[PDB]
Design a protein around this ligand. Structure first.
Ligand SMILES: CC(C)(O)[C@H]1CC[C@](C)([C@H]2[C@H](O)C[C@@]3(C)[C@@H]4C[C@H](O[C@@H]5O[C@H](CO)[C@@H](O)[C@H](O)[C@H]5O)[C@H]5C(C)(C)[C@@H](O[C@@H]6OC[C@@H](O)[C@H](O)[C@H]6O)CC[C@@]56C[C@@]46CC[C@]23C)O1
Length: 431
């Protein structure tokens, strides 16, 4: 029968102290979860596995020289007036490398296609359930490499106060480059983080003070470039006054997914619905941040619509509203939101009490991030998976698909809704 065991855990320091102040975007995650995403590889031929594991360890240490935050620790100071400060010490305490073996477990055991994510996937990551504020002691980066019968899985656990999704995949891209033989990564990080005024740091903040919580399931759906292009043309074709085809491919897809979920759940048309986009500030500040600004740089944009209007008003109207919410995340709004946060620096609560699955839907990650170029020397990955640790939030996570211009979405919802989506011919997914 199949089994899973850890064979070794090793501290990995940078191959070759500095302090980093954290801004509002970074602090907001202190009480929340890590980023856990990983890559599946098939080994067509035999591989010298001990040498492969050693090569991943040494290239990881080399990459860490260029990303010192991932080898450091958080420093939190708690004060008597119920406030706190936090920063990153690049003290080279080290990341963690975990070597696991999944005896008699295969690629296809992990990647049940058109099926739900199997429970084994969650055990391909280490430090599940650890909040980002525990980075004062816990490594900010854990890599778990799990040997399979016909390949390996490379699963990263990354502290979400240090990095967002963009910065996560910057590190993965650069590590694969170093592993392939590059001497430097092709994109170097910008480590200095953004504050409206140099006097703002260290920010003194306060900690603290769901429908089907603990019972959600996770399933992938694949969207071809053609089906996406169909959705974009339809959405722009429905909103003509005042358009030169400004609704984007992703806006139309997300509008379609929103409509499909709500249609499958069958809810009262008077329900108010909240759709949570994460809008990058890097390109929207004036002056803009560096493209490879390393840290968090995104703010929620909340799309609010009645269920009746969402469905009866047509795809283009939903996508146009999302477009407009995105367009309101201007340089003015970003800086004023920052300033009012400094005036009431409380870390958020996870929000309202939800009574159905479509009520509050969070949209995470991006199809812009480079998933399939992560060749460490043995070929491109077959797939990307997350830990699927989250069983509380109704959530859609966006991934680049294997074929050019396609998108995989990882959907966390009640089981019967995922079943309805898989049986819905209006859901334009494939395979
Ligand atoms: C009246 C309105 C306008 O309809 C109201 C009704 C209520 C709501 C629906 C809005 C609130 O208004 C504000 C709101 C968005 C919350 C506060 C957070 O949002 C941040 O709030 C702070 C202020 O506290 C702002 O300064 C930031 O700009 C903003 O982004 C966010 C994040 C950043 C933690 C977000 O995190 C991702 O989790 C998943 C990971 O996979 C990702 O990687 C990671 O990012 C999860 C959702 C979540 C918890 C919630 C939930 C929804 C809320 C509760 O809208």
């Amino acid at each position: 029968m199949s089994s899973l065991r850890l064979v070794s855990s090793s501290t990995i320091q940078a191959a070759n102290s500095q302090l980093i102040d954290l801004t509002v975007w970074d602090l907001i995650g202190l009480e929340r979860e890590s980023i856990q995403q990983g890559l599946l590889y098939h080994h067509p031929n035999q591989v010298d596995t001990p040498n492969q594991i050693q090569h991943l360890k040494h290239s990881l240490s080399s990459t860490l020289s260029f990303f010192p935050p991932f080898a450091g620790r958080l420093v939190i100071t708690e004060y008597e007036d119920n406030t706190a400060t936090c920063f990153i010490a690049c003290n080279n305490a080290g990341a963690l490398f975990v070597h696991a073996v999944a005896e008699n477990t295969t690629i296809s055991d992990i990647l049940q296609p058109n099926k739900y994510v199997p429970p084994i996937v969650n055990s391909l990551f280490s430090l599940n359930g650890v909040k980002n504020r525990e980075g004062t002691i816990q490594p900010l980066l854990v890599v778990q490499v799990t040997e399979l019968v016909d390949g390996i899985f490379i699963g990263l656990t990354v502290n979400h106060v240090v990095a967002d999704g963009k910065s996560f995949w910057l590190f993965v891209n650069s590590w694969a480059e170093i592993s392939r033989g590059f001497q430097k990564p092709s994109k170097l990080p910008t480590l200095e983080r953004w504050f409206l005024n140099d006097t703002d740091h260290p920010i003194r903040f306060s900690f603290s003070m769901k429908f089907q919580s603990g019972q959600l399931t996770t399933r992938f759906f694949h969207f071809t470039r053609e089906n996406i292009a169909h959705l974009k043309s339809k959405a722009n074709g429905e909103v003509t006054g005042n358009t030169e085809r400004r609704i984007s491919s992703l806006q139309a897809l997300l509008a379609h997914v929103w409509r499909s979920v709500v249609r499958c759940e069958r809810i009262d048309p008077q329900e108010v619905l909240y759709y949570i986009l994460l809008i990058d500030a890097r390109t929207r500040l004036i002056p803009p941040l560096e493209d490879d600004y390393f840290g968090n740089a995104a703010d929620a944009g909340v799309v609010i619509m009645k269920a009746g209007e969402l469905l009866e008003g047509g795809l283009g109207n939903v996508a146009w509203n999302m477009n407009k919410v995105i367009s309101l995340n201007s340089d003015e709004k970003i800086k004023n939101r920052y300033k009012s946060w400094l005036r009431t620096p409380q870390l958020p609560s996870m929000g309202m009490h939800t009574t159905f699955a479509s009520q509050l839907l969070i949209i995470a990650n991006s199809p812009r991030f480079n998933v399939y170029g992560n060749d460490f020397g043995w070929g491109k990955p077959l797939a990307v998976r997350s830990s699927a640790e989250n069983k509380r939030d109704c959530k859609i996570v966006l991934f680049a698909g294997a074929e050019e211009g396609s998108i995989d979405i990882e959907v966390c919802l009640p089981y019967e809704i995922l079943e309805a989506l898989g049986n819905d011919a209006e859901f334009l997914d494939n395979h």
